[PDB]
Design a binder for these strands. Structure first.
Ligand SMILES: [Mg+2]
Ligand SMILES: [Mg+2]
Ligand SMILES: [Mg+2]
Ligand SMILES: [Mg+2]
Ligand SMILES: [Mg+2]
Ligand SMILES: [Mg+2]
Ligand SMILES: [Mg+2]
Ligand SMILES: [Mg+2]
Ligand SMILES: [Mg+2]
Ligand SMILES: [Mg+2]
Ligand SMILES: [Mg+2]
Ligand SMILES: [Mg+2]
Ligand SMILES: [Mg+2]
Ligand SMILES: [Mg+2]
Lengths: 83, 115, 154, 100, 100, 127, 211
RNA sequence: CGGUCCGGCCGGGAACUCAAAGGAGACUGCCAGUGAUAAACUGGAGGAAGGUGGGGAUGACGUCAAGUCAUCAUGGCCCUUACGACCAGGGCUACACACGUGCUACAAUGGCGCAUACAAAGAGAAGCGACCUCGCGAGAGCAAGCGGACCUCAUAAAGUGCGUCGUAGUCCGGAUUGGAGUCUGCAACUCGACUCCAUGAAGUCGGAAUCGCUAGUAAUCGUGGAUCAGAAUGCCACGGUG
RNA sequence: CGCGAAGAACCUUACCUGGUCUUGACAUCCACGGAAGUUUUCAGAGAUGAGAAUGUGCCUUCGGGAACCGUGAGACAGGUG
């Protein structure tokens, strides 16, 4: 895990976007490529679209998602079965 | 020798007998013995009824046995329902810590299944 | 070995009993280059054997070897297309090596607690003409008798 | 390597050299134990915006003649293949076949 | 009143030997006592490279740099001695370090 | 006075000084039994002394550096041998027949490229 | 099989280095790269001056470049006009003041680089490869060489299938480490492809070492 | 030798270990026998070393249209608002499976706890980083020294003494997973290393088959380096026991 | 088959998905204007697109020159094809 003394890591662009969306009450999906950003408590009610590599995938944040990276909720490899 | 509910420790040294409790390992065991004032090398057989009750109190200060099994189950369960990367890896029974699956992922996949 | 240009390498005598024979015994019980472990296993086993059977250690050791040493062994040899297990007489050095090797292997295949105990038990058994070491030596002697027909024959 | 790949490396060095001081001070603020939380937060956010190339860890050592990204030797600055060529032509002082 | 240590480094023993003999000769011409040249241990840097462009590991060449090191102690720091050594030049393949 | 011998075995160098004495054997400012717990190592050190009839007639001051228990013991045996011979040249014939005069030149063979160790080669498969 | 580089095996035995300087790890790579740049520039500029070797000896604050050539005149120029401009540009590349010396090769028929360069020049001029190799071998033997071997490889005569040909007179004891064997390789970029030329010239055994 | 702060500590020495330069030494030279009055072989002596003393580097003419047009160069071909170029995210890490090479084991010649002994080789300035303090620890703060036979990495480990475990899937084994962290790095989700607490899988020596090694070798036990911000069970080296 | 790779989180990277560029990321020649450079704001995932402020040297000619910046035109560049 990242060091506690360094705090969490959220990309500035997404940080600017999330605060504007929450203050304006906007409900439109926030398209982002930032998979390395931790989910701050501020976006608990927002729908973020995170690039899985080829598509932006919709993730509605929930209380249980705080502290996790955004990328965790955007599977990058497609495996259905071997047969 | 009925510490932590059903767990029954044996006649073996106390510090190692206490490891039979789910939730207690060697480090915690030594802490139990040190806090309760019983030598680690004594046997549970030789252990006196006054000393055993003290051990039960020192173990109760920890989340062990069925409480741990509920705690562990809730943690795995919340990952799966939440549906993050580590949830899917738990649901599909594949290594959750980034280990290679091309080969050598048996402890998670079980015995080999022929094509 | 195609040129037969090898002599022999010197072996230092065992420290406690001054025996080159017993020094060679400690080199077979040795595993992983740990000779100090092996001598401690042998000296303890020999001490237990001496107290168990009387006598000293060297003569007690010697009697066990003379009861495990073979005399004739089968060697596959090819005359014509046909091969035969010709019974051949063995050299005294080969006798000692085979006897020591068999005692150690038989001792290893035992269920006692310590290797010293396993070695002492198997070594005392050899003195009593019983045990896997002498049993398999009998097997060697029995297989040679079955092929006594092919001694000095095609 | 390709002319583009070698060119990418020259840019990475240029940006790293230009922003060395700014990045260094920000990392000092981050590691400062007696620093206020808002100052550390501003340092984290400031470093992110700084160009990635300016990071001295995004630079790959490449052979100084061919630009090869693998088999590099820091002492000589060249890939194993160019080192052996220079060594057997006597262009590397002191270097000779080793034997022991 | 003081003493200087002359640290000679080279890649060639025959070269560093002639340059140390020159320094010890010069000091005696400027009348300074000199503790005799002391051979400090030689550094053997050692390099191992693959010799084929593709694949074929186990095909390797091994190289070594042997840095020879000599030390000279001019105990008599006569004013003439130090000045002569500053105006003195040594063979290119020799590194000379001055310590007061 | 002091009779000196240098002894080497594997990676060790042993400096031995011999003066007529009661039989005190000191190694690195510590006794023989305290320096060497191994009976094989102790026997090696003493070997040149009981082969000759001087077990208690000489005092040995030994300082040994480098190597391991057997290397250091073997280096010490070589030093005492060379020191006894300087002390009394008559000893050469008995020391040579025994073999203590030779310097065991067996060193550790270098690891070679393509081999895991000096000689062991990685496992082979035709197919 | 494949053979060891003749110059490299005998470096420090009978052959000297073309770069003779000391440098700590910090300056070793930069100095080595600087030598490469100056050697590349000198060869390109003096391609028609018949240069044999360039020895870059770096005194502490300078770069002394010694150029061995078989035609010193065209190199030095009139009143050193050419060697002067060469010094200036070499100093510019190195970053330190430069000193250039011009060594003359008495026999350009006994120097491997000259022979290899001449053979490749004829090949680029479309001369028959066998003739060039034979002429080189005969010239060296006339000039007193103890031995010579010349190898030419790759689409000889414009052939679709490449091959290797080689001539050898005298002795070329490649295994002998005290043998003064000057080896050098050059390449000819013809219209059909690249032709590689390798020359070995054995001049006699050296008794004594680096003396 | 003289004191000791008992320490090469100080004076001092230049003996010794060692360092690294220059020499010496080994040649079937000597002796005997065999052999074709030969080459050579065998034993002996002396010697530190004996017959090529040990190891390395060194690879003939050629062979396989062997490998590499992705190190580089290069004939021809081909794209040239694209097959060139920039960027962000992802992939190279997927996983019914098959195989190669390893690692760790399956214990008692062993595991664990305490005490203690003996190396070699190396590396180091946007670097090695002591000591002291804080933390269970990985680490953190402070800060000396060192471009190095001086300082640091850096406590060798197997070994040895005592105790315990007593043959059990175990005080074996550490896989896997849950939690809490550390560090490098803009950034550790995919996909880093390491720590702590908990968890405690398979495995009780491996079918047909198959591999390495003749001496300081194999076996075993640690140590170092390169690459490298970080990321070794790989690789290249080094000694210990043997 | 622990092989190139002496070390794929980004980079490396040569692959993919999406957004972009077209004498071009890299080189030379030609013209036109500009010192180079430095410090800040917005938008964007970033490439980029917009703004500003500051800075105007060097050497002698006294028409300048040498470095770098942008634009245009092509001759060309570029290719781990
Ligand atoms: Mg190119
Ligand atoms: Mg990198
Ligand atoms: Mg070893
Ligand atoms: Mg070769
Ligand atoms: Mg040869
Ligand atoms: Mg082919
Ligand atoms: Mg192919
Ligand atoms: Mg990318
Ligand atoms: Mg791969
Ligand atoms: Mg089982
Ligand atoms: Mg365990
Ligand atoms: Mg062999
Ligand atoms: Mg690293
Ligand atoms: Mg391999």
């Amino acid at each position: 895990p990242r060091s506690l003394k360094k705090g969490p890591f959220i990309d500035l662009h997404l940080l600017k976007k999330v605060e504007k969306a929450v203050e304006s009450g906007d409900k439109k999906p926030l398209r982002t490529w930032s998979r390395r950003s931790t989910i701050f408590p501020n976006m608990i009610g927002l729908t973020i679209a995170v690039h899985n590599g080829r598509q932006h995938v919709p993730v509605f944040v929930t209380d249980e998602m705080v502290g996790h990276k955004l990328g965790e909720f955007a599977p990058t490899r497609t495996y259905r079965g071997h047969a | 020798a009925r510490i932590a509910g059903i767990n029954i420790p044996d006649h073996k040294h106390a510090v190692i007998a206490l490891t039979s409790i789910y939730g207690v390992g060697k480090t915690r065991s030594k802490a139990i013995l040190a806090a309760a004032g019983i030598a680690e090398d004594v046997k549970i057989s030789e252990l006196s009824e006054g000393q055993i009750d003290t051990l039960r109190d020192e173990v109760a200060k920890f989340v062990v046995e069925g409480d741990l099994r509920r705690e562990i189950s809730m943690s795995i369960k919340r990952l799966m329902d939440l549906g993050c990367y580590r949830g899917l890896r738990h649901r599909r029974g594949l290594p959750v810590r980034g280990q290679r699956t091309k080969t050598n992922a048996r402890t998670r996949k079980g015995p080999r299944k022929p094509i | 070995p195609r040129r037969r240009v090898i002599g022999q390498r010197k072996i230092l005598p065992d420290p406690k009993f001054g025996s080159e024979l017993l020094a060679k015994f400690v080199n077979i019980l040795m595993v992983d280059g740990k000779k100090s472990t092996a001598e401690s296993i042998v000296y303890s086993a020999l001490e237990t054997l001496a107290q168990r059977s009387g006598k000293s250690e060297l003569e007690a050791f010697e009697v066990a070897l003379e009861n495990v040493r073979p005399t004739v062994e089968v060697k596959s040899r090819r005359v014509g297309g046909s091969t035969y297990q010709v019974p051949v007489e063995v050299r005294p050095v080969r006798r000692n090596a085979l006897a020591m090797r068999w005692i150690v292997e038989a001792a290893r295949k035992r269920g006692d607690k310590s290797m010293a105990l396993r070695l002492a038990n198997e070594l005392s058994d050899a003195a009593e003409n019983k045990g896997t070491a002498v049993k398999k030596r009998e097997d060697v002697h029995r297989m040679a008798e079955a092929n006594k027909a092919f001694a000095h024959y095609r | 390597a390709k002319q583009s790949m070698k060119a990418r490396e020259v840019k990475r060095v240029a940006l790293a050299d230009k922003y060395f001081a700014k990045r260094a001070e920000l990392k000092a603020i981050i590691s400062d134990v007696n620093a206020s939380d808002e100052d550390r937060w501003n340092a984290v956010l400031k470093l992110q915006t700084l160009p990635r190339d300016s990071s001295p860890s995004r630079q790959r050592n490449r052979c100084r003649q061919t630009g090869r990204p693998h088999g590099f030797l820091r002492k000589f600055g060249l890939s194993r293949i160019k080192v052996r060529e220079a060594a057997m032509r006597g262009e590397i002082p002191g270097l000779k076949k080793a034997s022991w | 009143n003081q003493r200087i240590r002359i640290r000679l480094k080279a890649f060639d023993h025959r070269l560093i030997d002639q340059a140390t003999a020159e320094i010890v000769e010069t000091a005696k011409r400027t009348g300074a006592q000199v503790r005799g040249p002391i051979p400090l241990p030689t550094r053997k840097e050692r390099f191992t490279v693959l010799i084929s462009p593709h694949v074929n590991k186990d095909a390797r060449d091994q190289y070594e740099i042997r840095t020879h090191l000599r030390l000279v102690d001019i105990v008599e720091p006569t004013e003439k001695t130090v000045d002569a050594l500053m105006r003195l030049d040594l063979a290119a393949g020799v590194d000379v370090q001055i310590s007061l | 006075n002091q009779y000196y011998g240098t002894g080497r075995r594997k990676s060790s160098a042993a400096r031995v000084f011999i003066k007529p004495g009661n039989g005190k054997i000191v190694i690195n400012q510590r006794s023989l039994e305290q320096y060497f717990g191994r009976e094989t190592a102790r026997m090696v050190v003493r070997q040149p002394l009981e082969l000759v009839d001087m077990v208690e007639k000489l005092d040995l001051y030994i300082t040994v550096k480098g190597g391991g228990i057997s290397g250091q013991a073997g280096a010490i045996r070589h030093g005492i041998t060379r020191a006894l011979m300087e002390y009394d040249e008559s000893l050469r014939s008995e020391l040579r027949k025994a073999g203590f005069v030779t310097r065991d030149a067996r060193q550790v063979e270098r690891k070679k490229v393509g081999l895991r160790k000096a000689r062991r080669r990685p496992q082979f498969s035709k197919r | 099989g494949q053979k060891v580089h003749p110059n490299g095996i005998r470096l420090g035995i009978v052959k000297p280095w073309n770069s003779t300087w000391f440098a700590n790890t910090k300056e070793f790579a930069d100095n080595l790269d600087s030598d490469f740049k100056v050697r590349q520039y000198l060869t390109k500029e003096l391609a028609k001056a018949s240069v044999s070797r360039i020895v870059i000896e770096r005194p502490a604050k300078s770069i002394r470049v010694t150029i061995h050539t078989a035609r010193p005149g065209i190199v030095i120029g009139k009143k050193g006009e050419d060697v002067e401009k060469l010094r200036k540009v070499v100093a510019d590349i190195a970053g330190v003041p430069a000193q250039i010396n011009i060594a003359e090769v008495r026999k350009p028929e006994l120097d491997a680089k000259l022979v290899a360069d001449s053979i490749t020049s004829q090949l680029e001029r479309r001369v028959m490869f066998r003739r060039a190799m034979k002429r080189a071998v005969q010239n060296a033997m006339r000039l007193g060489a103890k031995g010579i071997k010349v190898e030419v490889s790759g689409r000889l005569g414009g052939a679709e299938i490449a091959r290797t040909e080689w001539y050898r007179e005298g002795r070329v004891p490649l295994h002998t480490l005290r043998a003064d064997i000057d080896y050098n390789t050059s390449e000819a970029h013809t219209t059909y492809g690249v032709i590689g030329v390798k020359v070995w010239i054995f001049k006699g055994e050296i008794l004594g070492g680096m003396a």
